[PDB]
């Protein structure tokens, strides 16, 4: 579309690769550093989609 269709999403970060045919979605907050990210996002805490 001219204005851009933004209803298609794909993951960016994941700790481990997924085995064949794994489908069940998940939208938690992926932590980057050893500091445990909880709830909201910030430094070294990114949305994975």
């Amino acid at each position, epitope marked *: 579309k001219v204005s851009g269709n933004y209803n298609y999403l794909y993951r*960016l*970060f994941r700790k481990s690769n997924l085995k064949p045919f794994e489908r069940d979605i998940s939208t938690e907050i992926y932590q*980057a*550093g*050893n*500091k445990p990210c909880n709830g909201v996002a*910030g*430094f*070294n805490c*990114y*949305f994975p989609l």
Partner: antibody, heavy 123, light 107 residues
């Protein structure tokens, strides 16, 4: 080595546009690495401008520099650009970009890589 | 918008002793989102301490960070002549980040 290099000083007339870019040598920004930009005047403190995430593309800006500065990232060369317009006399300072090393898995909670900054002056 | 204040304004202690500096904020604080930086004259600042237990490459054991509440402190076991520089406190967790004001340590 794995390290970040910065451009050189320059003098720009007021009421014009200024572009700044800092490079990385032997180091890629992958999808998790992020970097921030800071400015240091002469005999002054440090003020934070903004930091962006290479992967998601989210950007953050200081409230007083909401329109003055625009920050962008480049995956192809793994670098960061700033564009500024109508520079004033207080802008004559040294600009640094600081990032932590990070390789697709995890990384430190502090900025340990640093450049040497660009000395920008207005005359 | 959180403001960071460092104390004392200046430090004048002879080399070979233990030194202490402090920085405090106003809003809420987190243990591992505060970092301490030093800046040599004419050189860009380099990471010293972050998270109160982590260290950068080649950081000597003399550096230490203390504090759990709003007030945080930096302790130096043994000073050496060219360690004299300006120290800055930086925060991550809160609203758009702000640095400190700088503390000059001298003889």
């Amino acid at each position: 080595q794995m390290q970040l290099v910065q451009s050189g000083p320059e003098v720009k007339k007021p009421g014009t546009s200024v572009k700044v870019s800092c490079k990385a040598s032997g180091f890629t920004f992958t999808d998790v690495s992020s970097l921030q930009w800071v400015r240091q005047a002469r005999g002054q403190r440090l003020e934070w401008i903004g930091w962006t995430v290479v992967g998601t593309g989210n950007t953050n800006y200081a409230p007083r520099f909401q329109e003055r500065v625009t920050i962008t990232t480049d995956k192809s060369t793994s670098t960061a650009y700033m564009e500024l317009s109508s520079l004033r006399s207080e802008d004559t300072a040294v600009y640094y970009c600081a990032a932590p090393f990070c390789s697709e898995t995890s990384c430190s909670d502090g900025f340990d890589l640093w450049g040497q900054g660009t000395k920008v002056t207005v005359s | 918008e959180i403001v960071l204040t460092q104390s004392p304004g200046t430090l004048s202690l002879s080399p070979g002793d233990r030194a202490t500096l402090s920085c405090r904020a106003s809003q809420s604080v987190r243990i591992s989102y505060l970092a301490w930086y030093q800046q040599k004259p004419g050189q860009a600042p380099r990471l010293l301490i972050s998270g109160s237990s982590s260290r950068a490459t080649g950081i000597p054991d003399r550096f230490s960070a203390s504090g759990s509440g709003t007030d945080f402190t930096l302790t130096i076991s043994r000073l050496e002549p060219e360690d004299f520089a300006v120290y800055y406190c930086q925060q991550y967790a809160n609203s758009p980040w702000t640095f400190g004001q700088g503390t000059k340590v001298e003889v």
